């Protein structure tokens, strides 16, 4: 099988700058008919893959002119000039010349923006839920950069790492910010024998903790 080696694995880039992704086949992808079926696809978060380039260097209708592809034999490149925020997602090369057709491992393009502090909020369990017998404490850390951020849960001052699960969103196509949700699940009964609940957020923006309670 033709192996498609893609580089880089991650491609952070500032808005306006150029970006380059390479793909190398482990053997030639020139078809018997002399055609090279090398394509490029963009997988944006929450969507189906979308075709960018086919036959090495032909831009698919509707694809902005800032995308171009070139290469031959075993070496191919996708160029994105004047990168825009809407260009975020995972790019994959693909060879449709030899069965089994194969995709590269993917390159996650990320927009590099000014560091931004997260917006922190917290929500106690809802009445409707409690009745049930559960008690969910929800913390949102919206619109920050870069991706890395920290969160620590403390009951009446004492930490609590078990029971708390966290989920990060992919980068936002509108403002290039990341957001996360941390959920500390505890029982309806233990939720009642405690008073203050705390959610902290330690980013790279301010060296001063972000507490909501």
């Amino acid at each position: 099988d033709v192996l498609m080696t893609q580089a880089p694995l991650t491609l952070p880039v500032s808005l306006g700058d150029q970006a380059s992704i390479s793909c190398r086949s482990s053997q030639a992808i020139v078809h018997a008919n002399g055609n090279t079926y090398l394509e490029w696809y963009l997988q944006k978060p929450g969507q189906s893959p979308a075709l960018l380039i086919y036959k090495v260097a032909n831009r698919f209708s509707g694809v902005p002119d800032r995308f171009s592809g070139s290469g031959s034999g075993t070496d191919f490149t996708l160029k994105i000039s004047r990168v825009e925020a809407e260009d975020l997602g995972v790019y994959y090369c693909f060879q449709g010349a030899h069965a089994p057709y194969t995709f590269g491992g993917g390159t996650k393009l990320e927009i590099k923006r000014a560091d931004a502090a997260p917006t922190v909020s917290i929500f106690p369990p809802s009445s409707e839920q409690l009745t049930s017998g559960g008690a969910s404490v929800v913390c949102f850390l919206n619109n920050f950069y870069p991706k890395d951020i920290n969160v620590k849960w403390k009951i009446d001052g004492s930490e609590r790492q078990n029971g708390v699960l966290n989920s990060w969103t992919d980068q936002d196509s509108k403002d290039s910010t990341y957001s996360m949700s941390s959920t500390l699940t505890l029982t309806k009964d233990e939720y009642e024998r405690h008073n203050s609940y705390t959610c902290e957020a330690t980013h790279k923006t301010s060296t001063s903790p972000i507490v909501k309670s």
Binding site: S48, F94, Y101, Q129, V138, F140, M180, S181
Partner: protein
């Protein structure tokens, strides 16, 4: 217009078989081949095979040919992928896609296949109440993926953040937030609309 309509979600038991469909419309079905692509939660994309409805010929990734069969019914413009001998390694999102001259120009929306013996469980949807105000929707304890969340039936799209689900004790939980202006709530009604395809359930939770 051209559309490839799949089914976003099905559950199947280990060892059983599942047949997924891709109904094409908007073009002459027999003139393009239909391909199937697999995307696991972290394995990149994998080409499964294609079927040429005109000739009847299906090509297979030999790595999966013993558990995969592709067919096509021109009369209903539908292509099918049947997977047999299911294991949890088969759980993934599978897409169908059309091809002829370019590459894969139109793609279905993807179907999430989960292989498990667990039962289908609808989500409980709890409203989340509190310059700027951040509201929410907690979608807890459902199985299998996926769940989709909309605000005001589509009418409200900007300012939304829906988080990926986290699994725990064999059930998923997800959250969605929506930072909207103060002049809106509560004057103008707002609602969380949740859909859980695998159980054919839809829930509308208006905020507080």
């Amino acid at each position: 217009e051209v559309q490839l309509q799949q089914s976003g979600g099905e559950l199947a038991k280990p060892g059983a078989s599942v047949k997924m469909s891709c109904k094409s419309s908007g073009y002459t079905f027999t003139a393009y081949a239909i391909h199937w692509a697999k995307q696991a939660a972290g394995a990149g994309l994998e080409w499964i095979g294609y079927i040429a409805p005109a000739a009847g010929a299906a090509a297979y990734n030999a790595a999966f040919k013993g558990k995969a069969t592709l067919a096509a019914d021109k009369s209903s413009s539908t292509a099918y992928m049947a997977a047999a001998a299911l294991t949890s390694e088969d759980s993934a999102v599978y897409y169908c896609a059309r091809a002829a001259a370019a590459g894969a120009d139109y793609w279905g929306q993807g179907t999430t296949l989960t292989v498990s013996s667990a039962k289908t469980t609808p989500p409980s949807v709890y409203p989340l109440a509190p310059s700027m105000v951040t509201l929410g929707c907690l979608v807890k304890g459902y199985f299998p993926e996926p769940v989709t969340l909309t605000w005001n039936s589509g009418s409200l799209s900007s300012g939304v953040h829906t988080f990926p689900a986290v699994l725990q004790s064999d059930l998923y939980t997800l959250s969605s937030s929506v930072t909207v202006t103060s002049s809106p709530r509560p004057s103008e009604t707002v609602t969380c609309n949740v859909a859980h395809p695998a159980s054919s359930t839809k829930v509308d939770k208006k905020i507080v």
